[PDB]
Design a protein around this ligand. Sequence first.
Ligand SMILES: CO[C@H]1/C=C/O[C@@]2(C)Oc3c(C)c(O)c4c(O)c(cc(OC(=O)CO)c4c3C2=O)NC(=O)/C(C)=C/C=C/[C@H](C)[C@H](O)[C@@H](C)[C@@H](O)[C@@H](C)[C@H](OC(C)=O)[C@@H]1C
Ligand code: HEM
Length: 374
Amino acid sequence: PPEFVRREDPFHVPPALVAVSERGPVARATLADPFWLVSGYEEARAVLSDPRFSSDRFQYRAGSFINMDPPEHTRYRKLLTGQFTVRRIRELGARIDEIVAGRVDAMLAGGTTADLMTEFAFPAPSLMICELLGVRYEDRAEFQQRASALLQMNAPVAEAADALRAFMQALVTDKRANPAGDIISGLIHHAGADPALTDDELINIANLLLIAGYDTTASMLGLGIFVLLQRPAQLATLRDDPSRIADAVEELLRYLSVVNPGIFRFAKEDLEFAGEHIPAGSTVVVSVVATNRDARHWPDPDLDLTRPRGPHLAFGHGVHQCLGQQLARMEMQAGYAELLRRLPNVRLAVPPEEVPLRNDMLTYGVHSLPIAWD
Ligand SMILES: CO[C@H]1/C=C/O[C@@]2(C)Oc3c(C)c(O)c4c(O)c(cc(OC(=O)CO)c4c3C2=O)NC(=O)/C(C)=C/C=C/[C@H](C)[C@H](O)[C@@H](C)[C@@H](O)[C@@H](C)[C@H](OC(C)=O)[C@@H]1C
Ligand code: HEM
């Protein structure tokens, strides 16, 4: 229902979500059939930690643990979390530091303008996923090609883009043959899997890591700059007080809420949660944007990079919180800092209302971002 998915601009919650949120923190709406929308922050964490609710749309390839419930979800997640070791995070963070520098090095070498999405926001997230999956330098062109084949937009799998699946097929075979330090190697060689992951499981996880971390991280990075460019006092705070970068990124996650139209749950059971009667199989969707703006939790919900960090729902809650949230944070922290610091007097190169937003996409963001500097 488009009125729930559409965002006119990023500084307001959609009027229809605001209408529903007025009825209740959890409130029925009509699809097509009634589903519920959660706009309350405590209510959201409550549905997300609640086990009467499923991530399986159909029940009430494989290895795709984001639509799985524990026990089965928990087996893969724990394999995935275990390979997210300190040694990985440290190396990936240094890679990430290198990545954001090369893209800015390339923007500055190019002239005084760029489209931010082309030259920084899609490329930085993309290259980090390369490092994560152990994609070699000579294969990144091929890799960057096959995965900007999302138009417009979102898809599992690729129905049966095998081209991407085919690339991942070769990579895994490669990894079994020659084990490096990447996430695919560890799962195969060092995650202690019993039973051992199959090629299909391994392919399906690799795509999910790209899919899950790529649009979201790129939409965050582009939209965050776009918002800073319209809110010059905020931009200065981040650019001028560089030690406050950890708090700023946490604010953009909460204010921008790129996950649109929200996190999805289904009721395994007939249930009553917060006074509502919910038949089995009914969609429950947590609106990330509305909830991160709950006035009961945040008296002032407007954007403040001055604000000290607290929890928000941009990365989900409970058993499925982004596996990638620490990598996304390092890239968002590294990437916003490098642009504001290295691009003098950065500004939009076209008027703000001319900028193209993604309202025909699941993940909220910007299509193009023309910018200038000096
Ligand atoms: C967006 O609608 C999804 C959301 C389902 O619920 C969960 C919590 O699980 C889930 C799963 C298992 C996915 O496999 C998934 C995928 O691939 C994408 C995006 C998801 O949403 C997010 O998590 C945001 O971070 C998501 C899942 C999810 O949230 N990637 C895609 O490329 C994509 C296009 C998903 C949705 C597609 C269509 C909108 C869908 O066909 C429509 C029928 C929707 O109305 C939903 C019913 C949708 O269908 C499914 C099973 O994909 C589903 C509920
Ligand atoms: C700002 C950046 C990001 C945002 C806003 C974001 C948001 C989310 C959210 C809300 C979920 C929960 C969805 C659900 O509960 O159904 C999620 C799950 C996930 N994210 Fe992200 N994410 C980001 C970056 C990344 C990155 C960089 C990765 C890198 C691999 C990634 C991988 C995943 C995975 C694997 C899951 C599934 C976790 C599970 O089901 O166990 N994400 N993300």
